[PDB]
Ligand code: HEM
């Protein structure tokens with residue numbers, strides 16, 4: 001039994017864990033580890049938005065261009081591509097790139113080939129929407145939790161190794177306790193999403209300024225290796241409730257502090273689906289997310305199922321990563337996207 | 352004319368500059384430039400404190416040990432060594448190291464050679480004080496201003512080049528306007544310096560937790576190369592008033608939000624003085640520092656002299672660097688130092 005907080009990130013606490021030192025969790029779970037060299041990661045979501053069959057091939061070709069850009073020097077270490085249809089009826093292709101070094105990310109982003117493409121007036125006449133939602137949490141500002149040990153997805157893939165079994169899980173509040181910064185910091189939101197260039201209502205190029213301690217969750221499901229048994233457990237017994245939860249956040253999240261809820265399925269560059277999905281959730285604060293996860297019947301129903309089946313699990317892969325970031329480490333930019341896209345929906349015009 | 356804010360760090364402003372776009376400064380001044388690869392610097396002040404002639408040789412040797420540690424793998428790019436006698440009558444040797452990569456800094460800090468020496472029980476029995484005051488401002492969170500273009504000292508030494516003449520200087524508020532983060536952030540202090548291990552009153556090992564937006568100023572004077580004329584201008588006409596302002600901050604700074612004011616002179620490892628000095632000032636916020644600089648007769652007197660003599664200066668080198676940093680990027684640690692040392696003085700015991 002180990003703490004989820006890596007030894008180099010342990011600090012004298014000025015805030016207490018939810019559970020006492022004697023706490024033992026109910027079943028094994030693991031976290032991603034990295035040594036002191038991992039200072040900050042960059043999580044970059046790049047999207048292509050389109051409407052209808054009419055624009056499907058153009059969208060895939062734009063996304064091929066973006067993914068190809070990841071192969072340029074200082075591109076991300078790892079990436080994956082997803083699709084979802086939003087509540088406005090628009091299709092959205094999203095690729096996430098992970099960097100383990102923010103200087104490399106910035107070299108890539110500022111490079112002529114990348115920046116000339118993104119800043120070109122030509123992006124405005126292509127009948128597609130494009131967007132960038134980028135955050136750079138420090139090592140202190142994220143946590144991961146896996147129900148398995150090998151082949152860690154998402155941010156875990158850019159870290160060094162897997163921990164042994166960790167103490168801080170199996171109770172509400174445990175996510176927070178796994179963030180090293182929770183030792184001393186409440187992670188409170190300040191200020192608001194703010195429109196700082198363009199107009200969300202009118203398309204074109206729009207820049208949304210972020211705010212400190214926006215929480216971002218990627219919670220994922222990978223059933224690609226499951227046999228008939230675990231495949232059925234997932235698709236028949238977990239997914240229908242999860243879908244209800246994701247629809248709920250998508251359609252009713254605004255008053256709860258859920259700025260954007262996407263429920264996405266991995267695809268390849270031909271647009272064929274893979275048996276892997278995840279939520280991408282942007283929240284005003286970690287506390288808002290905590291409230292929903294611990295009280296909504298959808299999440300509570302699947303939480304119970306997990307506790308019940310966790311011991312049997314062989315191939316079904318369930319995990320999450322959650323992070324917070326500083327305003328100074330966030331980018332939210334949109335080109336010809338509809339007004340409910342991502343952080344456009346809740347951005348404040350004149351705070 | 353150029354902006355002080357480097358092109359990659361310009362943002363849509365939500366806070367306005369103090370002067371309008373048409374403003375032209377009264378005389379030329381320059382800043383340090385670095386490209387997008389410079390993400391964050393680390394400024395590490397490492398000290399050895401002693402009292403009396405009886406501890407002098409032991410203190411110089413302790414500092415030789417510390418300076419020799421900078422040659423270890425992932426040591427600082429640059430460093431310099433200073434002496435001052437504090438108001439408590441203790442002598443203080445301080446070496447500053449600058450890193451341009453925080454991962455390198457952290458590899459060095461956590462290395463067995465460095466960390467075993469710092470954490471050893473042996474440190475407590477040596478009749479000397481040791482301290483570390485380390486901060487890591489992002490590129491957005493510091494500014495430099497030089498009255499010259501070549502051989503930039505301090506943090507400038509780890510940056511890439513010197514700018515052309517810059518717009519944002521010559522008025523109160525210009526320091527603030529030179530910080531890229533001032534485009535959107537008031538840089539307000541939150542919370543307080545807090546004792547989180549040990550007891551400042553009782554020596555031994557003491558850890559002080561920082562707070563967001565502590566301001567750190569290094570304002571320097573180098574007359575080493577001045578011929579007759581500039582040597583007299585400095586030592587006869589500037590220094591006596593500067594000394595009065597430094598004594599004021601040292602002895603009367605607490606109510607003003609100056610946590611620590613040190614006026615130090617460079618030395619070699621033998622303790623021979625060099626003709627270079629600087630202030631090392633730690634302030635609750637940039638605003639507190641602004642108020643003092645723009646209103647105190649000492650600083651105002653030398654400000655005026657500078658305006659008068661700036662056109663003539665050839666060899667006398669005057670400059671500053673000012674930074675703010677996040678609580679999560681600060682270290683304030685003390686071993687057997689007296690209770691008025693650095694951040695021990697104003698640290699709150701039970702906030
Ligand atoms: C297959 C789908 C899911 C299942 C079976 C599931 C189940 C669970 C379980 C069992 C835990 C506690 C883990 C532990 O500490 O050992 C947990 C934590 C959590 N889940 Fe889910 N979950 C799923 C999807 C999601 C999604 C899509 C969200 C998005 C909001 C979410 C939000 C959370 C949060 C915020 C926590 C941390 C609670 C805390 O520690 O305070 N979950 N989930």
Ligand code: HEM
Nearest residue numbers: 520521522523524525526570589593630640644653654657
């Ligand atoms: C020989 C010593 C010094 C001289 C001749 C001097 C003079 C000046 C001058 C002329 C400026 C305005 C520069 C410009 O914007 O063009 C300035 C700015 C400033 N100085 Fe000094 N100074 C000296 C030392 C110090 C020291 C030791 C401190 C430490 C507190 C200090 C604090 C400041 C601050 C905070 C500003 C920025 C004011 C603002 O832009 O709002 N100075 N100084």
